Design an enzyme around this catalytic site. Structure first.
Site, PDB file in Angstrom:
ATOM      1  N   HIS A 140       0.825  -1.201   0.000  1.00  0.00           N
ATOM      2  CA  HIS A 140       0.000   0.000   0.000  1.00  0.00           C
ATOM      3  C   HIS A 140       0.857   1.247   0.000  1.00  0.00           C
ATOM      4  O   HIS A 140       1.081   1.840   1.030  1.00  0.00           O
ATOM      5  CB  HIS A 140      -0.928   0.040   1.218  1.00  0.00           C
ATOM      6  N   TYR A 149      -9.899   5.918  -5.571  1.00  0.00           N
ATOM      7  CA  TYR A 149     -11.126   5.941  -4.778  1.00  0.00           C
ATOM      8  C   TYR A 149     -12.372   5.828  -5.659  1.00  0.00           C
ATOM      9  O   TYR A 149     -13.276   5.029  -5.405  1.00  0.00           O
ATOM     10  CB  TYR A 149     -11.272   7.264  -4.026  1.00  0.00           C
ATOM     11  N   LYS A 181      -8.151  -0.798  -7.272  1.00  0.00           N
ATOM     12  CA  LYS A 181      -8.389  -0.189  -5.993  1.00  0.00           C
ATOM     13  C   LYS A 181      -9.698   0.566  -6.026  1.00  0.00           C
ATOM     14  O   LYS A 181     -10.068   1.069  -7.084  1.00  0.00           O
ATOM     15  CB  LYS A 181      -7.254   0.805  -5.791  1.00  0.00           C
ATOM     16  N   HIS A 209      -6.923  -0.829   6.001  1.00  0.00           N
ATOM     17  CA  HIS A 209      -7.152   0.161   7.065  1.00  0.00           C
ATOM     18  C   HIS A 209      -8.127  -0.390   8.078  1.00  0.00           C
ATOM     19  O   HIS A 209      -8.871   0.378   8.686  1.00  0.00           O
ATOM     20  CB  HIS A 209      -7.854   1.429   6.563  1.00  0.00           C
TER      21      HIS A 209
HETATM   22  N1  LIG Z   1      -5.150  10.092   2.116  1.00  0.00           N
HETATM   23  C1  LIG Z   1      -4.717   9.216   1.182  1.00  0.00           C
HETATM   24  C2  LIG Z   1      -5.840   8.278   0.706  1.00  0.00           C
HETATM   25  C3  LIG Z   1      -5.885   7.116   1.623  1.00  0.00           C
HETATM   26  O1  LIG Z   1      -4.860   7.054   2.431  1.00  0.00           O
HETATM   27  O2  LIG Z   1      -6.782   6.331   1.612  1.00  0.00           O
HETATM   28  C4  LIG Z   1      -4.257   9.862  -0.116  1.00  0.00           C
HETATM   29  O3  LIG Z   1      -3.098  10.338  -0.188  1.00  0.00           O
HETATM   30  O4  LIG Z   1      -5.056   9.899  -1.087  1.00  0.00           O
HETATM   31 ZN   LIG Z   2      -7.231   4.447   1.958  1.00  0.00          ZN
HETATM   32 ZN   LIG Z   3      -3.753   4.916   0.804  1.00  0.00          ZN
END
Ligand SMILES: N[C@@H](CC(=O)O)C(=O)O
Ligand SMILES: [Zn+2]
Ligand SMILES: [Zn+2]
Ligand SMILES: N[C@@H](CC(=O)O)C(=O)O
Ligand SMILES: N[C@@H](CC(=O)O)C(=O)O
Ligand SMILES: N[C@@H](CC(=O)O)C(=O)O
Ligand SMILES: [Zn+2]
Ligand SMILES: [Zn+2]
Ligand SMILES: [Zn+2]
Ligand SMILES: [Zn+2]
Ligand SMILES: [Zn+2]
Ligand SMILES: [Zn+2]
Lengths: 389, 389, 389, 389
Positions: free
Chosen positions: B68, B137, B162, B230
């Site tokens: 990750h 995302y 992902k 996570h």
């Molecule tokens: N905050 C993280 C996203 C994640 O860690 O899920 C990023 O750099 O996008």
């Molecule tokens: Zn994440």
């Molecule tokens: Zn991440």
């Protein structure tokens, strides 16, 4: 002599200041369109080449922020002749408006975001502050870049998205569609540093706010990003709005709507309901049409909104509703800037933008400053749009 | 003299080897970046031009595999200034990492798969081993070739996809969308010979793993292909994770998360729970941001993860948790290679790649070998990225 | 005590000022990031809460405008390991750069305008001024909105377009393609209030400026919108550049190119050839690679450009060429601001932005103000990018 | 007993070695598929678990690189019944081919690059080395990712692009189209670390190489990236090819073309014309069809190419032309590896891949090693493709 004129030093003296907070008799010093000092008794000589203004016997307060305006014109519900004209700068300033948020409505065929965006920029150029929402009634949204998420992230003036629900003019969106669109606006806002709000034009359908709730169950978008507008259009609707705000949502009341719930009335009820003024906003819907549908969804009457109802609402509140001037202004000032995160707007604080109104004690507009510039004098635009006639 | 230098014969002598399996004092012979022999007492002369290394009094173990990592940088949740920088080779090696899996996060507007892919290749070129996941995302996924199935099948370095669920930053995906995306990754993996996994970034939403279950009812993708990460971010979440693993799923614990469930803690609980270490992985989330949201989904604090927590976790486990070194390493070695099917990785076996760590008995990194190459000496990178400064 | 701190009152006292124009020993009064007054002997008490700075003994001038930087990195000409890293704020400021123009180069596959766009905003957010060019070497152009015209017209930070000609790394554009693109840029600039320029990266091909000339005959784009860069890369090229400027064109000299024509040397001849400094600019190409190609077009050597060459050039000019400090400055200041129409930049005048350099009489940078904010002190950045370490 | 079998130690003893360079009787030591040492008299006991092979009496040389094969089949020029079949592993190996470049031809409707891509990986997986060219006769190119540049840059097996000119089967490309494509290929190669070549299929048109020349004047693509194939198809064509190589270009001779210029005959004249063997390659066009067209462009005869012509050519050269074995080899080895930059291929050096041919002194193939793995024994494949029967 040394020339210090580039600073545009202006000192507004002796007015009863509402920040909106009542600050009693206080002074305001301005430079380079910014408020650089707020205090009682500022030395008229403290700075060179200062324009001093005696506002004694007058009220001083922040400029209004109208977050619902059909900048490029709207309408068209009864065909092409019903397309409303674009908004003129002077009509806004004269109404106390110094910051505005433009959007589209029913028609997104003859109406385009690129047009709305160029107009937004024109207004900034001419002296006031303006932003826009991407999208329109239609869902999915018609954007500039092809993605709601993209438009909010990369188009500087875009701060969120607009849509239509519970209306006979909606696009019959499903929950997935709504959720995804709001989620995109949310994300785009974080990337671009924008509020990333989703504004819902509400109609008269019985379903009222249902779709909002459903949405909330189908995504993790914060309730603080969802904004139902025109909440006063109908009773049952207004009622659900109050719970919605009680649940933490903010609500937008339309000043151009007099029945069945009047603007001042609505605001008052929200308070009595125990909702904080911070979660209550007032918008005009200026330049849009006032279409009236019958029984079978047939149009009957059609008019066009102006901006006067804004002030009128404030006056009423005070006048007939026991509201404090301070309180009466919030819904057009700090509540809005607060919801949209408009930095530098809605409050008279050092470091904020010099967007100020000068009024009579009986609440009548006399002067208007936009970014420290005199736009209205004696209730008359002294600054007009490039082609205003 | 005859020159046999092209073979790069290296003999690592006298260390207490953890394969991860404890193999006691054992020797390791390396050639052409591959482990060609593992046995006690290997003849320092068995092969010509051999570099012999006395690791007596030291621990020898496999390199970590971090699945990750925001290779190209990440962040951006609080606007553009919060975009994190790209990862430097030395930061990985020095942390014990020899194999890494890159991915994207919240932002896939300023962040692109093609960028991630070129960076992945750079790392392989510079000496370590790297792969990536397509998507981010956002769902639907933003791919390189236009199809998740296509990206996994034809892009050599892509091993899966992902996505973000149960997070206020998700795209509000429905089950169809999720199922189809996972099913595509699955199929692409069989065609391209990849694990074809689907990695789910989990947020703090109450819905937790629900979406996973739903998915499972709406498709025939094997639970072994679904990877929630996570999992330690919140209690209730962590708890469901344990059942999920009990049902045969594998789970990924984030070392950069200290509350509410600490990394070592989580691992220990999984065991006590009767879950096999093989179904437990540890990843860093290095170079991503550590965004902290408030009540109304408002950001408050924002930081950036590093890779030190990896080792630290192992140390803890041993130190404060009664774990065997062997056991403590699995989650960063064989469990990962096992889940992702990384052939030649995570175990010291003849025929495997010479990805090795040299540590002190108290578990401190001294040396690092990547494909048989010395990258770190005395806890210091002796091999750096082309522009590392 | 009345607080007037919001104003950011700063008075720069008694330095020898080059606006760039020699103004002898003159004072500078700043407020809100603006230069509000320039004159000899300003009363340290003229404004409240003023920060007085004694520049006696020193030189004060305008901050540099570098219109040719690979903000997000570049390179890639020899594989993925050659992709350079993004630019760090401090790197810029320390080099005297207060205004920058970001662009892309050879690689437009692993590099995207959206990324560039974000990086540009981050820089503005951090303290300096930044814009960018859409496109890259590739023709047709790779844009954000899908059209060059549209990008220049509607994306606020985009001021024009980039391309490459007469290079073994070009897209082999034909004239139509060139002309259209420049036309588009031209027009978008009118609509968006941008310069609407087209920057030509020059290669080492024998055809040299031909394509620009042909273009000229195949379109009505003003020669004032066309910028050839890296002119000093070769003799014969340099020489046509000269005539080009003679015809009214403006040429750009790369400070990071030593042979055959060094920077200072290029500027000297311009002047010798009777060319007005206004038509001559200097830019770094910072963060780009220094790819050296063979006879068969094979890469050999590859390096990475910095920003020190800028100041260095100024120094040399003055020091070994007998250029007035004033004249030496032009190409990095007024000339640039001049070509790009960077209103409020390049000169020290009331109303201008307070982007100032404070140097020793020997041309050493001590302090740097960006929009009136102290960025560098004692030749070191007291203001760093969010992730600098 | 210590197991050292992982190493795959093999020692090839006492053959007369042609690297291709005559190295007389020399030994070859292999490990992990790599050539680790080449020298006279290597101790059979120098390494453990070694497999010793007595090549006394024989010839050992590098395995052939055939850069022109229709891996997945071709044909179709006379209807669907004429589509040839895919290539079988054993077919290749038996013919001395250890390295191959796959491509498409006339038909890019029933044939796709994705198919080709898959077939190429399968071959690598099975034991040999394989790459491919994107595009086909058709121009503009039909690609995998939609862009030639993108395909060359990001798809690992793609080394350049294919096209057809001066043929009644061409797409009638114009110069712009040609130039752009080659440019794209050129650039993608830089980014992806590929040769970035453009291979021109030559037809029997009178215009012959013109298009390549025009191209040259319409772009900055190095002549070293351009490969004309089937040069021996006609006299006048052959003859310009010669000058072409003379100008620094490299030409490709098709071994499966007997008239008018036979292969060996083409190579002889090259040499006669003073052309360095380095600029001359030989390729089969195996699996393609042998379509013969009339006067009115009507097909008459149609056949299918094999790989035996390669060895045959070598034989003839040596046998009827007085070419050194060494020189005879070049066009199928160092020359190819040379043009395509196939690192680790074409020569027998330490560090190179162990792709070797073992022949009788009369030039008969007995054994074949691909990456050090015994593929052919006693002129027969002991290693077959997954579906050979
Ligand atoms: N905050 C993280 C996203 C994640 O860690 O899920 C990023 O750099 O996008
Ligand atoms: Zn994440
Ligand atoms: Zn991440
Ligand atoms: N009638 C309005 C729409 C709305 O007010 O909601 C218009 O102009 O489109
Ligand atoms: N080499 C530079 C290109 C140039 O200087 O235009 C790059 O980073 O692409
Ligand atoms: N006839 C061959 C074409 C060629 O040889 O290029 C084919 O299979 O298309
Ligand atoms: Zn509405
Ligand atoms: Zn409206
Ligand atoms: Zn350039
Ligand atoms: Zn450049
Ligand atoms: Zn052909
Ligand atoms: Zn062919």
């Amino acid at each position: 002599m040394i020339d210090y004129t580039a600073a545009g030093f202006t000192l507004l003296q002796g007015a009863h200041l509402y920040a909106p907070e009542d600050r009693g008799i206080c002074d305001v010093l301005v430079a380079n369109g910014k408020i650089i000092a707020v205090a009682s008794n500022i030395p008229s000589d403290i700075v060179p080449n200062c324009t001093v203004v005696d506002l004694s016997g007058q009220i001083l307060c922040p400029g209004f922020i109208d977050q619902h305006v059909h900048l490029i014109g709207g309408g068209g519900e009864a065909g092409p002749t019903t397309r409303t004209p674009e908004v003129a700068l002077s009509r806004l300033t004269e109404a106390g408006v110094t910051s505005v948020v433009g959007l589209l409505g029913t028609d997104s065929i003859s109406r385009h975001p690129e047009s709305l965006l160029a107009k937004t920029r024109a207004l900034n150029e001419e002296g006031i502050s303006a932003w826009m929402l991407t999208g329109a009634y239609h869902v999915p949204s018609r954007t500039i870049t092809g993605s709601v998420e993209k438009d909010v992230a990369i188009i500087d003036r875009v701060i969120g998205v607009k849509c239509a629900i519970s209306d006979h003019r909606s696009a019959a969106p499903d929950v997935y569609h709504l959720a995804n669109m709001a989620a995109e606006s949310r994300v785009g806002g974080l990337l671009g540093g924008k509020p990333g709000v989703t504004v819902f034009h509400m109609g008269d359908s019985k379903k009222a706010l249902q779709p909002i709730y459903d949405l909330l169950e189908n995504c993790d978008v914060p309730i603080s990003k969802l904004l139902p507008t025109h909440v006063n259009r109908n009773v049952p609707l207004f009622e659900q709005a109050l719970e919605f705000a009680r649940k933490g949502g903010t609500i937008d009341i339309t000043s151009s709507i007099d029945e069945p719930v009047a603007p001042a009335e609505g605001i008052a009820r929200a308070v009595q309901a125990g909702i904080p003024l911070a979660r209550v906003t007032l918008s005009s819907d200026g330049n849009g049409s006032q279409p009236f549908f019958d029984d079978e969804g047939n149009l009957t009457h059609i008019g066009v909104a102006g901006f006067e109802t804004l002030l009128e609402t404030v006056q009423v509140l005070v006048k007939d509703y026991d509201f404090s001037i301070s309180d009466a202004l919030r819904p057009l000032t700090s509540s809005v800037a607060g919801f949209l995160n408009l930095t530098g707007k809605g409050e008279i604080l050092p470091g904020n933008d010099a967007d100020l109104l000068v009024m009579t004690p009986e609440l009548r507009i006399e002067q208007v400053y936009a970014r420290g510039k005199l736009m209205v004098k004696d209730g008359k635009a002294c600054v007009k749009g490039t082609f205003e006639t």
